[PDB]
Amino acid sequence: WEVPRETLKLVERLGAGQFGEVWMGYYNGHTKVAVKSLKQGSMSPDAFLAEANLMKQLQHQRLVRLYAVVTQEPIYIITEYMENGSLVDFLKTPSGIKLTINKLLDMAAQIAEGMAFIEERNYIHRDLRAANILVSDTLSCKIADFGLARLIEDNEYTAGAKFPIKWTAPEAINYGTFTIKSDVWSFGILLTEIVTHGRIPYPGMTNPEVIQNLERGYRMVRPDNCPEELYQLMRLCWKERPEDRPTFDYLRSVLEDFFTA
Numbered sequence: 001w002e003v004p005r006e007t008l009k010l011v012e013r014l015g016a017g018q019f020g021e022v023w024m025g026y027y028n029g030h031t032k033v034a035v036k037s038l039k040q041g042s043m044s045p046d047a048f049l050a051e052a053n054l055m056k057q058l059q060h061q062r063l064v065r066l067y068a069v070v071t072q073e074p075i076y077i078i079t080e081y082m083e084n085g086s087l088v089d090f091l092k093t094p095s096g097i098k099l100t101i102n103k104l105l106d107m108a109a110q111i112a113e114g115m116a117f118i119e120e121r122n123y124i125h126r127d128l129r130a131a132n133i134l135v136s137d138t139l140s141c142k143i144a145d146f147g148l149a150r151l152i153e154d155n156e157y158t159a160g161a162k163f164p165i166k167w168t169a170p171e172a173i174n175y176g177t178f179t180i181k182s183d184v185w186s187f188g189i190l191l192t193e194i195v196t197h198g199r200i201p202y203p204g205m206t207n208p209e210v211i212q213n214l215e216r217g218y219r220m221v222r223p224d225n226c227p228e229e230l231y232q233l234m235r236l237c238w239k240e241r242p243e244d245r246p247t248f249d250y251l252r253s254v255l256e257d258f259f260t261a
């Protein structure tokens with residue numbers, strides 16, 4: 001997995017943040033890659049490499065696959081470059097805009113397939129949303145960046161760190177209890193993003209507004225142009241009781257059929 005740092009040529013910053021940056025570059029000149037570098041101090045070089053180790057163990061068709069690493073400060077995590085960036089951005093570009101519900105549902109099914117495997121392996125995402133879904137040149141999707149429990153859950157630190165309100169389940173917002181079921185709720189919201197081609201969820205509301213209404217049992221209205229059948233699948237994702245929400249396997253199962261229809 002190790003590669004001399006010389007085989008990498010950074011070219012364009014893609015993302016920056018608390019723990020480092022993500023750059024687009026080349027490996028041995030010909031291979032286009034995405035490189036994540038750890039910001040010295042931001043976090044243990046060990047906890048940083050944890051993400052890589054998880055990646056090796058969690059390889060799958062619909063998940064971001066590790067390519068290589070550089071284990072000397074500054075540590076790098078390298079993956080292959082996904083040409084169309086993040087799903088949420090892709091859906092607003094001319095190509096993404098013209099996509100028919102069929103192609104959209106297929107993509108939704110791919111994500112559901114990725115989540116089924118994650119559920120299968122006893123893991124949780126914690127920050128499932130279109131911004132963390134990557135799209136390749138042939139429009140196949142892959143799930144990326146699990147949300148760090150350190151910054152999203154209840155503990156010493158967050159005690160005052162927070163999360164993406166509009167995508168988070170009621171139980172997680174209130175009691176900080178994140179399970180695969182809250183990832184399911186989240187999937188429901190991700191579903192609306194896809195069908196609306198990137199529109200922000202709960203149009204017309206602020207985060208504190210969302211929170212208030214959620215208590216009264218409020219749920220997003222079916223988007224114009226969203227099949228009513230698909231809509232009721234979303235409603236299953238937003239059931240009040242977590243244990244009442246469907247599994248990704250079923251979701252994956254049901255999405256694949258709307259698509260062959």
Ligand SMILES: COc1nc(Nc2ccc(N3CCNCC3)cc2)ncc1C(=O)Nc1cc(C(=O)Nc2cccc(C(F)(F)F)c2F)ccc1C
Nearest residue numbers: 022034035036055063064077079081082085143144145146
């Ligand atoms: C921005 O990161 C990328 N961006 C593109 N393309 C792109 C992005 C934007 C744009 N833009 C921005 C400019 N405007 C035009 C469009 C144009 C191309 N391509 C690849 C990456 C990419 O792999 N990133 C990446 C992701 C992870 C990661 O997920 N870790 C992880 C963590 C936990 C669990 C798993 C699991 F379970 F899933 F295994 C994981 F995998 C780790 C390292 C890296 C480098």
